[PDB]
Amino acid sequence: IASRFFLYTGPPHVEVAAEVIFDGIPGFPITNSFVVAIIIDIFVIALAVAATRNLQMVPRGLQNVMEFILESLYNLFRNINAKYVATAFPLVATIFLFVLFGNWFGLLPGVGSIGVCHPLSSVAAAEGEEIHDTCAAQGKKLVPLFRAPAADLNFTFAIAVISFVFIEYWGFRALGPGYLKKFFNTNGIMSFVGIIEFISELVKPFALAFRLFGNIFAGEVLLVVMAFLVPLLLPLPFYGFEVFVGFIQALIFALLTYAFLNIAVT
Template sequence: MSSRNRNILIVVGAIIAGIAARLLFPMGQPAISVKAEDIFGIPNFTNSMFVLLLVDIFLIVIAFLATRNMQMVPKGLQNFMEWVIEMMFNFFSSINKKWTPAAFPLLATIFLMVLVSNWTGLLPGFGSIGFCHAGEKQATLALNVKDPYAGLVPSPFAAAEGESKYLGCQPNESLVALFRAPTADLNLTLALALIAVFAIEYFGFRALGVGYLGKFFNVKGGPVGFIVGIFEFISEIARIPAFMFRLFGNIFAGEVLLIVMIFLLPLALPIPFYIFEVFVGFIQAFIFSVLTIAFIGLATEHHGDDHGHAEGAHH
């Protein structure tokens, strides 16, 4: 069989499988909300905040179970968690040996919380289980995916005229998801970014004292040094949106990708994307914590001493 005929059969088979899957597994119209939504009728208590509380409880329970019966020769959960903590500590020490002992509680917390938060969005029910809410979602806050199979076959999941396009909801109602990955909410990623940048500045002042400000306001370096300091200050502030949007963008984009793939072909197509998103969730937690310790290392460098050593070597 030629490669052309094989490709045609694959495309035709995918279309047939997609139509069959949609008939066997009816689903409502997906709506991808950019904004976290209030749940339980509590103002400012969003679905992402609810899941974050569950993530915190999960990590606390794991820590309790791993340490409730400490043994000299660890086994079971204690052995596994000691291996995880030791591996993280050794890795961060390879980046910055001096400040890792002081910064490790923050780094480990960020990594584990972000990792679990990222992976929660891959669990069944996230984005599909929720409450029916009166009225349609605002177009500026939701992306409605159109049905590509409309008109090809009779669609049992398509809403008839006057009916809600969300399963289990009444006409003129929309779905508010009960679960949302915390890191797919800009509020959490902003909070994590502020915490990370605050920690970086704290260690900078802790290492260099008031002289740390000379990195940004270099009045002794002449006009050039002053301009360079201003750019350093701008780059320091720019770390906040960089931390924030890198994490949010990757996790939210992954959720959108999975929802669209499940909507197009529920049976087999989403599996490779699920595997990819597991990897992405780990990488984003890894990058966030590694950048934090790396920036702490840059902030604690004695720039003046390095400059003086460089001048002495030049002379």
């Protein structure tokens, strides 16, 4: 059982960085995050059209799974605010359906291994191996081809800012000029709490983006570190925790977006 924890074949170190730019020969540079964003856009669109291409009674197969997921999300959002459950559903459904597969793509084999480059070999008396990389030649860093889309502070910041813009717009949509009434209303002590609530609303998109990016980045780095410590049979529970927490983060991103929208409208 534990006798097969051979570290004679393991990674040399733990490469950690933010989003790394791909070659990007033409203008409009694309990164490793903006190739996995495209690949997961393609996957989600293909999945949606496959579930949609034949819609009928008695769902079974891809259509049944899609209906179950969609109705579960609809019931979850309805429990918070039934008035806007359908007016804002596409945003807080695509957020989940995208972030979930973004987090689950980072765990696929080869994420952090295939790069584009823009026993005897391992060191002894150490618990971590030191086998070099294929593009050690030319002294390159082996820029990973695939990264988790949420592990980049650009895509996550983008979804946070679109969520914040949506919340602000549809709080302004039906409240009159009541936003100025919730903050700095000079109703005795209500002015201070209104200013604090305005500050909190301002920092909400930053909190969401930082939370999602940090969770996904930390999961991927923990996986790399556990692989470095012991290549096999060590990162199994950590892989399970990572997939669970990726699904969790995907769900609560949409949940927090809709909850903030509800607290804004009412």
